[PDB]
């Protein structure tokens, strides 16, 4: 249906995607992030946020893909190809995932308009040489 | 995280199994609703509700899981133990995502009080034995 | 006719003769930054600004080189003239498209006087002697040199 | 991106593929034009037009591609197969160019809103069947 779920929130997978792959963190240190900061609001019975919705859905449709996978890898018998199906979700569906991970907790722990400020500066800064950058990277910070 | 997505709204899983398996329609017919009502919000970069936000991770989350079977049958080469994972892929997954289509498309076209009448006045006409269980059902509709 | 096509915009063709070729992003990268910037803007009815005007056509006209070059090395046959043309035109014509992708994107979002200043002062510093010049180039960036945002 | 060169001014790659290809003037006959006419306005300091602007980066970038198309031809073994590559930069670098030239010179000359229903009214004379077409092909003036 031509649905970004992005663009509600004022970003796009253009935009995510202007970062490296390999700069987002993994899905098991996210997850353990969430629970840490906002258990109490997503297993709880209000609107917090559109964010904590649709963690809320991503974090089922996690649990869904990782129980589909399970059971093919359970049921087939050849660690090769398990490998092989492994790599595929990971590389694809799991790098999305993380970019959902991200975008929303980082959202609701630092600001909509800083992460996406930083989405744009990041790209610029690993886009530009060295030599004529500042050297050392950016970063989200609560601490003043 | 113990995530119900039905809570956050005013209901639970255990609520929706009032309604048996096989009363909710195909994710053909629910993708067709909500194409034809709500596209033109759905596509749209506001958050018009909790329900379409949900509506769209969830179709989103449809569109991988489809991906990832239709790769992986691609892959293979047997039609036995490829009809078997579709019909359980079938089963689960899209059991759940059409309850959480016909709930939200539902409480986006009659109400989520009115959806959870229904809900309850269902489970009423589910449970009373075949011998005293009216003909005429309970129906969500605009009309008399 | 003689055009500067950044006269228009108060820099000259001297002013940026002195950025090295090693201070511009590659076409690709100024290409994603532009497209994940301002594409809403790029692909959109409007003169929103003579930036975007120029950027638009600098793009269409890049595509053309683009053809163009890869058509001439696909009907070649050996990759050492391949190569060979594949490395002029980049030192000769990416080098200066990078150079007016950066000038129209920086001016979009730090300011015209403010890369004019820029330019400058890198200029000031390129002239300068290694032995006799800081060893850290002029920053021109959107963050603190500190790179934490809160 | 999906940029279109004409959209930020009014038209379309599909409103002016109405005027076929053998339509549009020489690249000199349209340079000759721009000089003549906007020469001091052109090479001036000045934001004069988006389409000053748009026509300066087009004859900057031709100009280019003529470098580029120059040392390759050059540097080619056979005169045949320089023929081959003028002939294809010709064919749809040059038609591109003479398209953008003659768009933004025939604006700045007669008026956007003048150009757009030229293009539109050429359509018409186009699509017209011959037998009933007349020859006065529609052209831009200003007396």
Redesign the interface.
């Known amino acids: ?3 970004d ?1 992005y ?2 929130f ?1 970003a ?1 997978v ?2 995510l995607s ?1 970062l490296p792959s390999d700069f987002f963190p993994s899905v098991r240190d996210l ?1 353990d992030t ?2 840490a900061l906002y ?1 109490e609001a ?6 917090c946020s ?1 964010h ?3 963690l ?6 996690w649990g ?2 990782m ?3 399970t ?2 890898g359970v ?1 087939l018998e050849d660690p090769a190809s398990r490998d092989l ?1 492994v790599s ?2 990971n590389t ?2 799991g790098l ?1 995932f993380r970019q959902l991970l991200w975008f929303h907790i980082s959202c609701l722990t ?1 600001g909509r308009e ?1 992460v996406i ?2 989405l ?2 990041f ?3 690993i ?3 060295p ?14």
Chains 1, 2 share one sequence.
């Not at 809320?56 to 449709?61: D, G, K, L, N, S």
């Not at 004529?132 to 990277?137: D, E, V």
């Open positions: 249906m031509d649905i779920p663009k509600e004022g796009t253009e935009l202007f997850l969430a629970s258990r997503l297993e709880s019975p209000e609107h559109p904590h919705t649709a809320r859905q991503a974090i089922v449709c869904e893909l129980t589909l996978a059971w093919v049921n199906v595929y979700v694809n569906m999305k630092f800083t400020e930083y744009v500066s790209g610029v800064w886009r530009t040489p030599a004529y950058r500042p050297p050392n990277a950016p970063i989200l910070s609560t601490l003043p």
